[PDB]
Amino acid sequence: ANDVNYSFDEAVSMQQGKGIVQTKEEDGKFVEANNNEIAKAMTISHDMKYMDITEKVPMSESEVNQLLKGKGILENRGKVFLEAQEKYEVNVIYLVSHALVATGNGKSELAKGIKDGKKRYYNFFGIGAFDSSAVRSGKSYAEKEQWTSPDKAIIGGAKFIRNEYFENNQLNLYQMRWNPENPAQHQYASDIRWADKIAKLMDKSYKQFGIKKDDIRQTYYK
Ligand SMILES: CC(=O)N[C@@H]1[C@@H](O[C@H](C)C(=O)O)[C@H](O[C@@H]2O[C@H](CO)[C@@H](O)[C@H](O)[C@H]2NC(C)=O)[C@@H](CO)O[C@H]1O
Ligand SMILES: [Cl-]
Ligand SMILES: [Cl-]
Ligand SMILES: [Cl-]
Ligand SMILES: [Cl-]
Ligand SMILES: [Cl-]
Ligand SMILES: [Cl-]
Ligand SMILES: [Cl-]
Ligand SMILES: [Cl-]
Ligand SMILES: [Cl-]
Ligand SMILES: [Cl-]
Ligand SMILES: [Cl-]
Ligand SMILES: [Cl-]
Ligand SMILES: [Cl-]
Ligand SMILES: [Cl-]
Numbered sequence: 001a002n003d004v005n006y007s008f009d010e011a012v013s014m015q016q017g018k019g020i021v022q023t024k025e026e027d028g029k030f031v032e033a034n035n036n037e038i039a040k041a042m043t044i045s046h047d048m049k050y051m052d053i054t055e056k057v058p059m060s061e062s063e064v065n066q067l068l069k070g071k072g073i074l075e076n077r078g079k080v081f082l083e084a085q086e087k088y089e090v091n092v093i094y095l096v097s098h099a100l101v102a103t104g105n106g107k108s109e110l111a112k113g114i115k116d117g118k119k120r121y122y123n124f125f126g127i128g129a130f131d132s133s134a135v136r137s138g139k140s141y142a143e144k145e146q147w148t149s150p151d152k153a154i155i156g157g158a159k160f161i162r163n164e165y166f167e168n169n170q171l172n173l174y175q176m177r178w179n180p181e182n183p184a185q186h187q188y189a190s191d192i193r194w195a196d197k198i199a200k201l202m203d204k205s206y207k208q209f210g211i212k213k214d215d216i217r218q219t220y221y222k
Contacts, residue, residue: 003169003181008221012039014183021190033192041192042178047216048199048206049173053091054166055214067096067205072106073150074099074124080151084158090166093211094173095158097201099124101194116143122153126189127160172217173198180220 006014015022016035024033033041064078074096081099085092102125103111113120114135121142123130128141135143141160147153168186170176173195176188188194206213 004219004222005181006183006221008043011178011180011183011221012042015039015042015178017184020184022192023190024192030191037192044174044218044220046218047213048202049177049195050216050218051173051213052171052215052217053094053173054089054162054171055091056085056089057091057093057211059085059092059209059211063209064092064096067093067208068106070105071100072103072108073111073122074103074106077150077154080154084155087155088158088162090158090162091214093202093205094198095154095161097198097205098161099154099157100201101197102126114140114142119148122147122150123157124150124153125157125161127157174220178220 015038022033022038022041023030024037025031059082061078061082064081065076068074068076068078068081081092081095084090084095100106110130111122111124113122114130114132116135121130121135121140123142128134130140130142134140138144142153145156145160147156165176165188169181170179170186170188175181177195179186191197205211
C-alpha cells in the first residue's frame with residue numbers, strides 16, 4: 001500500500017509540464033495559471049480536501065433536501081443523491097457539494113442539459129466532453145452512458161467517481177485533483193482551486209448538521 005512515489009519538487013515539475021491545462025478564475029473568467037500559481041495551489045497546508053470521501057455520512061433524505069433547497073435543477077433530488085451514496089459508497093455531502101460547484105448551484109444553463117433528437121443529456125459532475133458538438137458527434141460520455149434525466153446523471157456521476165477515481169486510489173479531493181501517486185495524469189479538473197471550492201461547501205454542510213469528519217491523510221510526497 002505504498003503510494004508515495006514522488007518528491008514534491010518532482011511532482012511540481014510534472015504539473016508544470018508541456019501542454020498540461022491548469023486554470024484559474026480571474027476578472028470573471030478562466031485563464032491559464034502560471035507556474036508559481038500551480039506550485040502554490042498544490043502545496044500541502046494542514047482539512048476537508050484531505051478527508052476520505054469514500055466513507056458515507058448519516059444524512060437523511062430530509063437533510064439532503066435541505067441542502068438542495070433553492071438549488072435549481074438539483075432541488076428536491078435528495079432521494080436520488082442518497083440512492084447514489086448507498087449504491088456506490090460515496091459521501092453524499094461531497095456528492096452534493098461537487099454537483100453544486102459543477103452546475104452553478106444547480107442554476108446554470110448547461111445544468112439543464114443538451115438536446116440530441118428526442119432525448120436530452122445531463123451532466124452534473126463535469127465528466128468528459130459536454131457541449132452540443134460532442135453530443136452531436138457522439139463523443140460525449142453523458143451520451144454514451146445515456147444520462148437522459150437529472151436522476152440518471154446523479155446516479156451515473158456517482159458511479160463514475162467510484163469506479164474511475166475511488167477504485168484508482170484517489171480517495172480525497174486533493175488526490176482527485178493532483179494525483180500525487182502519478183502526478184499530472186488522471187486529474188479531475190483543470191481549475192487549480194477545484195478542491196477548495198468543493199471543500200468549502202462540504203465544511204459548511206458538515207457544520208450545519210454536526211457531522212463528524214472521517215480520516216484525514218497527511219502525507220503524499222517523499
Ligand atoms: C472528469 C473529467 O472528465 N475531467 C476532465 C479530465 O479528464 C479526467 C482525467 C477524466 O476523464 O476522468 C481532463 O483530463 C485530461 O483528460 C484527457 C482525456 O480526455 C487526458 O488525455 C489528459 O491526460 C487529462 N489530463 C490530466 C491532467 O489528467 C481535463 C483536461 O483539462 O478536463 C477535466 O475536466
Ligand atoms: Cl506548455
Ligand atoms: Cl491536460
Ligand atoms: Cl427523512
Ligand atoms: Cl449560466
Ligand atoms: Cl467538476
Ligand atoms: Cl467524453
Ligand atoms: Cl473532458
Ligand atoms: Cl429525473
Ligand atoms: Cl490522463
Ligand atoms: Cl493514475
Ligand atoms: Cl488543492
Ligand atoms: Cl468551527
Ligand atoms: Cl456523524
Ligand atoms: Cl506530503
